[PDB]
Design an enzyme around this catalytic site. Sequence first.
Site, PDB file in Angstrom:
ATOM      1  CG  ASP A 111       1.395  15.158   2.470  1.00 60.54           C
ATOM      2  OD1 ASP A 111       1.495  14.652   1.326  1.00 60.54           O
ATOM      3  OD2 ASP A 111       2.174  16.047   2.880  1.00 60.54           O
ATOM      4  CE1 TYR A 152      -2.676  13.817 -13.922  1.00 60.19           C
ATOM      5  CE2 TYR A 152      -3.336  13.366 -16.192  1.00 60.19           C
ATOM      6  CZ  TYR A 152      -3.627  13.390 -14.841  1.00 60.19           C
ATOM      7  OH  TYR A 152      -4.869  12.991 -14.412  1.00 60.19           O
TER       8      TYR A 152
END
Lengths: 256, 256, 256, 256
Positions: B59, B152
Amino acid sequence: KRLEGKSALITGSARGIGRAFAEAYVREGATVAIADIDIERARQAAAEIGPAAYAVQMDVTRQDSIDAAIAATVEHAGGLDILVNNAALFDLAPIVEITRESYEKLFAINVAGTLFTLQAAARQMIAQGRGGKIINMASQAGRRGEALVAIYCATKAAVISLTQSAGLDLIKHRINVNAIAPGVVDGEHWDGVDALFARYENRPRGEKKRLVGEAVPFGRMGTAEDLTGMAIFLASAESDYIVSQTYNVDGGNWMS
Amino acid sequence: KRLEGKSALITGSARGIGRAFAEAYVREGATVAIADIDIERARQAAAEIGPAAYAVQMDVTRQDSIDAAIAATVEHAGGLDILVNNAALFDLAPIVEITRESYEKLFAINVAGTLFTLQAAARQMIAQGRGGKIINMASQAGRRGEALVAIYCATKAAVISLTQSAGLDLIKHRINVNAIAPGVVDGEHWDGVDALFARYENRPRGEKKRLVGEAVPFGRMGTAEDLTGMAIFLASAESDYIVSQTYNVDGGNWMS
Amino acid sequence: KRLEGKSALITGSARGIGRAFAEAYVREGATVAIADIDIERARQAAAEIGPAAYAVQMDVTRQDSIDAAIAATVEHAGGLDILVNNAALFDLAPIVEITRESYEKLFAINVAGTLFTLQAAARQMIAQGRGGKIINMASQAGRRGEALVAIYCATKAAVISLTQSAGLDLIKHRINVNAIAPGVVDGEHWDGVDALFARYENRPRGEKKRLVGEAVPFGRMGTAEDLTGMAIFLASAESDYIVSQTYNVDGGNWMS
Amino acid sequence: KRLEGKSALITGSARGIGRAFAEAYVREGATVAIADIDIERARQAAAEIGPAAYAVQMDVTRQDSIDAAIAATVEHAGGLDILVNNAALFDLAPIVEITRESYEKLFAINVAGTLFTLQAAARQMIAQGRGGKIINMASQAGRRGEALVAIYCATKAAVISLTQSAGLDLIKHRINVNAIAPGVVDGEHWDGVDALFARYENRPRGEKKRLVGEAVPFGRMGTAEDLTGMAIFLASAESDYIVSQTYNVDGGNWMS
Ligand code: NA
Ligand code: NA
Ligand code: NA
Ligand code: NA
């Protein structure tokens, strides 16, 4: 007076570049909210600048503070026409020594601070239905990476990008979003900046600043005053057709 | 062949592009850590690819998971030669609808995840003293802003900047840092992407995807296979003199 | 053997970078027209490289020589699949000393030579109906201006631009057009280049060359061998989805 | 006001964008040489603009014409303080139909014309010892290539490059060299531009112009008046620290 009757808010404008912008804007007929985390310094600055400048306490990393700052501007000046996102934090460290604290702090102030203040201003401007102007502070640092300055360069790259994106999204509301990218600007911060380079490059204190100054094509490091013409321009009617741009004012230190 | 004996780790490689990269690296003689948060699929993928691939739970938003992943390559492969930062998340919203949750989530994975995995890899590579290769995944979104994709785009702009800075800091350790910038790549994620565009651009479902595909100069959206050649190249000896570059592999969708 | 069965022509390949490309292409299975104004050296080079290399006389400044050169590859190799535009001339002078002769000569070779050779190759490739690869040689000089190198920089900027335009226009015929941008490459020419800088920057002989080499992040000036990998890559199937790009291979000298 | 007592020369200023610049400069207190190849059109424009405007016959493709024009400026005004290189020619054709005549004529006017006029103005400015301002006209076309516009795009890329190079070389003489890049500007030429696109793209007349206009984020094509603010700014003391930049004024049509 090119900004006559305009209402502006400038983040981090108690001192430094934002403070020079504040003074220039008032000279040009604007009312200016001196927004700063340091309410004491904001109040001093507002008093020095004159009746048209007024202090607002603001922490650009906090949503409630951002919204309160926008509302104080609407309360005091009747609305908001110009936003300058000037609040910023600098730091320096080689890749292997970058800490999560440096990353989080610089991104919270330089990117999130700019993004969410821009958003709150945008919403108020849309509600007003009169346009018009938002100026983000980028940097040469956002134009190209640098070995010891990864975090700060990355925040400024993010700012340039957000400038483009917001510019495209908000022009339909007659809101221009643009940015100014200074190169190297002299001021009270450079002692610490030089000290940081001196540490990691292992140079005598003062050598880095001198090399940097001597390398600006123009012949010297910049002053805040070099940048005020552009700050007025991008807030005036003469820049109405200018959308999503980042303009280098940097003595030739970077070419875009 | 080209990556014989090299130890690689690719984030987000259980699926899609990262998996195609892993399979291509194995064919080129590398040992590959299939690092993904989807450990179940990472294991199935590692099992399918063969004995040169092994699954690693990761992660990229957690420092301890990052450090444990690097330790795993040392344990399995004796060290790390190639890092590909492929893990990423996408989202879309106009400026006035951007949420703090979206900002924090995309920056944590796309920017912090890339930065701190890069940093962990670099430390291990410096300790090995055999140089290394690091490849970040950027995007056309990183080259220019877009009205509906501020968050983004900004993360990918930050990645390009970080690629530049890290490349300059790390080359003295014989570590190349570069990035690939894909254009539009077909895949199941486009149902949701189309849906989001359809909503904000007031279009019927499927129209956005269709138009985007038709506008790529090459004549179609990308596949993982379009990108695999470049991923090998930037990890191979043929790229040794290549430093701090972002390379567009995008059918001409953006020109740099 | 990434170029197996392909027919190539490389301008200015009797010596230097162009010859290194020709040798690399031959090793990858290509048949290569060694095209150069120095026919004597081109013949010697083709003889040393081996049977897949053959000499072709060409002056890229003359249309008839260009057309005859393309006709030669068709006759000897059956067709043309790969063009590399490598022929170029360098010069240096401050703005107030630039002559029309220098302007005319550098643009004729660097820009007209590349444009019209590209055009002649493209016509042949369209006629064949099998697609093709075209690789232009740009330079760091093409990425940003330079006080003493206005003419050469402008020609290389024109090349990058033409690479983009031609790439967009020719991809529908399955022709990829891209460019490589080297940084500083060591070689015999540097004695003259150093001498010219020494004069205008008032420096001791050899100082400019030394500083330039030490300023490359990688730690040294380039060699032809640093560039051969990219040259093969951009001519191979691994680059099919790559369109209108310029790729810097320069040790970090410029970041794009 | 902002250009009080300044002597300017603007190439191609009888009509179009140059004419608007001339008129705006005169309003700001400048004396302006209306340079055009069309002397009757120049004498007429000068008459209409006012006593501060005077006509000068000039062919930017001829050294003798260029040198004569600078001398007339020194003769009529006491010298030359501001140059605007606005003379330019447009053309369009896909790669396989580009002619040498199109190449030569556009480069002679757009590149050579700009370079050698800038050079003659620089020489005069250096001799005066009072510094100066030079503004080249670039274009969005110079920022990125287009399939049908290779020649024009390549000239405008060369202009941006020359702007950077000259800026760096001339700032030591206190001469600022910068450029303006309009996007799409409406005017008498667009009927022919649309016709060219209609021919090669096979469209009904007017369709290209409409689509182009409708794609500008701002909401419309530009006018010359959108650009006058920037032309004044870059000729004024407010831009003294601005060097080697190209500024897009284009409604968001391209982002730099
Ligand atoms: Na006050
Ligand atoms: Na396995
Ligand atoms: Na031979
Ligand atoms: Na007159």
